[PDB]
Design a protein around this ligand. Structure first.
Ligand SMILES: Nc1ncnc2c1ncn2[C@@H]1O[C@H](COP(=O)(O)OP(=O)(O)NP(=O)(O)O)[C@@H](O)[C@H]1O
Ligand SMILES: Nc1ncnc2c1ncn2[C@@H]1O[C@H](COP(=O)(O)OP(=O)(O)NP(=O)(O)O)[C@@H](O)[C@H]1O
Ligand SMILES: Nc1ncnc2c1ncn2[C@@H]1O[C@H](COP(=O)(O)OP(=O)(O)NP(=O)(O)O)[C@@H](O)[C@H]1O
Lengths: 302, 320
């Protein structure tokens, strides 16, 4: 029995909604190819309950899903099962605009109508690239996109794969832009600092073989982004120090590569034993920035 | 596994979609200790406007509304009907027709199109009808109401009520009567009489000498329901409802089926009573071995009191 209990009503609708669309999809055959109309398509449902089912949901709400077929394809191409995706959103309320699913597998980002429009502008080209690179990318993985309507207010959301491990704690964020920007004495007053380029140089050893696959990947992504006149991303980086973690059951530095899709173990010949997470984030908003950024990352490996 | 909701008309698709939708929704909703007053004023409404998506069987745009869902789920429970079952009967394959007199593909349930006025009359009587199904434990010749819906397709509204079938989902009806016990000439038409399975009326039955012989403990259970049922209806300003009577001929049912097997080369007279709920066997010492099906239908200078009494006498006499 899926109650849709959640702190905010808007969260209840997101749960209700992901549940609804995925069940509905399980009844729509998986086609032999996507079609052009699939990229212009959506699903809209308006609910009006009167004296019924009022416990966790609002009685009146709308739920809209953009290009359901495309995103179910992307999901597949990212090795994510629909039932799993559904369980991660519905089984428990997502948690703390930036959300994670209760199990930390997926990130839910609130976005503007301009973003949704930008998404539409890039989606076919972006899909074709996921095909061509067989899902092996450092680009953000777009899992679904929705418009919720609660109390006449519209809210747009994109679901992506979390960059960080869903289990392994993180101990240092780095948002790497590639001009100077640092961390705020106000932001450094928080438990998990979001440091930038300048702070990174002021303060990663994966080997020479993973670099030969990371950079292979990263450079092709950055190319594709340029040609989309997309600029202003970051590369998000995470660090998990194993030793500190220690201070039936899993173990230290133990992770599932098919789940924590961005996770990289450290070399043997390397200072502390740690697990890194790296992927490209925030792409919804060219060549200079791609050369200037691609070079910054390459200068952070050995 | 995949439910296409494929059907002869878009309206039936939407019917399938909607029964599927609501039963599924309902599965996420606990089962209450009691119903509350508002449960009887309650409804669910859904509006779908898909665009370029999922258009093979459903329309892109439709509405589905279910009346007092909690109250019908409860009716279903008291009539010994699982919601998953009910749902599979409506959604596994398209219902078939006889819009706008359908049966589920498996002949368990009947879907009747009704009027707006009918839907109103259901609301009027619903609180009373429910309480009646309570004190009578589900034992009644009255219609078993399992659901009530409004469909909107092409901006047209269609009202439908689901009942349990009076007839067997398995055994074959070879003859049927619709009886009111009226004073007026009730006979089947020239057109009716030439139909495949004509719906005969009071005077046909009478001028035909048929009695039904069910034998005592059956006759008693039946007549007791009838008295209680019709007295309930008369209480609720209800008139013009009929006793629906189907006859099944076992012998003819053993030969007809023996014709399919033969041409296909190129128990008998019994039924689960928990399923065929209005069926009674013919009396041990009767001519033909027969199964009857009898229920009241159509409840949505004569007044209701007199019609209740009258109807009851005629009915109480249709069978020895
Ligand atoms: N896939 C992901 N996995 C884990 N964390 C993520 C993921 N995507 C985004 N984030 C986080 O979500 C964040 C959004 O960044 P936002 O920093 O607050 O930038 P900002 O410009 O400084 N704030 P704003 O004023 O709203 O523009 C960062 O903390 C990211 O680490
Ligand atoms: N054109 C419409 N658009 C949307 N809703 C409508 C429309 N027309 C009728 N309705 C609603 O559909 C209903 C269902 O039919 P209505 O039969 O008379 O039921 P009711 O008996 O009035 N329900 P209740 O008051 O609980 O006894 C109406 O009351 C309206 O709520
Ligand atoms: N529960 C039921 N099971 C099987 N048949 C039913 C059931 N309820 C009603 N019927 C049908 O109802 C019939 C006669 O009345 P019903 O007519 O179809 O309403 P009506 O269309 O308003 N009046 P009419 O069509 O002229 O007889 C029978 O022939 C049955 O086919």
């Amino acid at each position: 029995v899926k109650l849709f209990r959640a702190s905010e009503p808007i969260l209840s609708v997101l749960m209700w909604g992901v549940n609804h669309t995925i069940n509905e999809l399980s009844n729509v055959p998986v086609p032999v190819m996507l079609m052009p109309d699939d990229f212009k398509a959506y699903s809209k449902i308006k609910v009006d309950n009167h004296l019924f089912n009022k416990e966790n949901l609002p009685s009146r709400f709308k739920f809209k899903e953009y290009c359901p077929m495309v995103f179910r394809n992307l999901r597949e191409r990212f090795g994510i099962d629909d039932q799993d995706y559904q369980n991660s959103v519905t089984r428990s309320a997502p948690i703390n605009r930036f959300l994670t699913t209760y199990d930390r597998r997926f990130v839910i980002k609130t976005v503007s109508s301009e973003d949704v429009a930008e998404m539409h502008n890039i989606l076919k080209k972006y899909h074709q690239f996921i095909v061509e690179c067989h899902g092996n990318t450092l680009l953000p993985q777009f899992l679904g996109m929705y418009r919720l309507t609660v109390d006449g207010v519209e809210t747009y959301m994109v679901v992506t794969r979390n960059v960080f491990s869903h289990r392994l704690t993180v101990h240092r964020k780095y948002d790497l832009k590639g001009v100077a920007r640092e961390a705020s004495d106000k932001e450094k007053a928080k438990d998990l600092p979001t440091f930038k380029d300048n702070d990174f140089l002021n303060e990663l050893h994966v080997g020479e073989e993973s670099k030969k696959n990371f950079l292979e990947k990263l450079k092709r992504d950055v190319e594709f982004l340029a040609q989309l006149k997309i600029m202003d991303y970051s590369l998000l980086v995470g660090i998990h120090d194993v030793d500190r973690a220690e201070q039936r059951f899993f173990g230290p530095g133990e992770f599932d590569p098919s789940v924590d899709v961005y996770a990289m173990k450290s070399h043997e010949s390397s200072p502390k034993k740690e697990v890194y997470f790296m992927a490209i984030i925030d792409i919804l908003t060219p060549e200079q920035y791609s050369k200037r950024f691609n070079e910054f990352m390459s200068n952070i490996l050995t």
